[PDB]
């Protein structure tokens, strides 16, 4: 019983460890995408505001 439990826990070890590492990879991907999205949002804000000032003129 103890041996089978230990082996089951080993299988769990590897499964969950991999899950966590994958999550970290996803974290990095999401981070760079969020930075790009924020840059694009600031760009669009600036563009719209400049157009609005020209419009007011």
């Amino acid at each position: 019983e103890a041996e089978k439990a230990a082996d089951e826990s080993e299988r769990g070890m590897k499964v969950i460890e991999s899950r966590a590492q994958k999550d970290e990879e996803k974290m990095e991907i999401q981070e760079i995408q969020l930075k790009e999205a924020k840059h694009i949002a600031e760009d669009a804000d600036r563009k719209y505001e400049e157009v609005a000032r020209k419009l007011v003129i």
Partner: protein
């Protein structure tokens, strides 16, 4: 060019001395001594103003015409002179009204174009066309044919 010395003349000594000694807040050591354009916005926060993306990006466009990605000290002085518009620590107006009296030499209430032409040639420069034409565009808005004390004040704002 004449913009560099005009910026020198239109700004007081204490302001520009503090401006330069305070621009020296970014330099720390082993640097070129000229900071990147975007860092300029940060020194402005020190100045006490809170500019905005439109003015910031425009002003950014007002430096580094030749496209080096960096700002020199003469462009630095011209942009600063072009930023705060409170020149001469508040231009006066009373003596200026005396000077309004000066522009008029027939005692009518306003400035004639002939009086402007003689006033301009009295400096030493003759009449050219772009001179008076641009001076009229700066001074007038609706072709009223004269420069009154409002347009008088407006045209030379900040000038000493």
């Amino acid at each position: 060019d004449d913009i560099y010395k005009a910026a020198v003349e239109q700004l007081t000594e204490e302001q520009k001395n503090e401006f330069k000694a305070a621009f020296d807040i970014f330099v720390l050591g082993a640097e070129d001594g000229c900071i990147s354009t975007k860092e300029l916005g940060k020194v402005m926060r020190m100045l006490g103003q809170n500019p905005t993306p439109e003015e910031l990006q425009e002003m950014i466009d007002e430096v580094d015409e030749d496209g080096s990605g960096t700002v020199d000290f003469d462009e630095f002085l011209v942009m600063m002179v072009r930023c705060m518009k409170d020149d001469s620590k508040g231009k006066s107006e009373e003596e200026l009204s005396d000077l309004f009296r000066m522009f008029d030499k027939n005692a009518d209430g306003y400035i004639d174009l002939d009086e402007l032409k003689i006033m301009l040639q009295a400096t030493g420069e003759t009449i050219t066309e772009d001179d008076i034409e641009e001076l009229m565009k700066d001074g007038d808005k609706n072709n009223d044919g004269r420069i009154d004390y409002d347009e008088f004040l407006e045209f030379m704002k900040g000038v000493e």
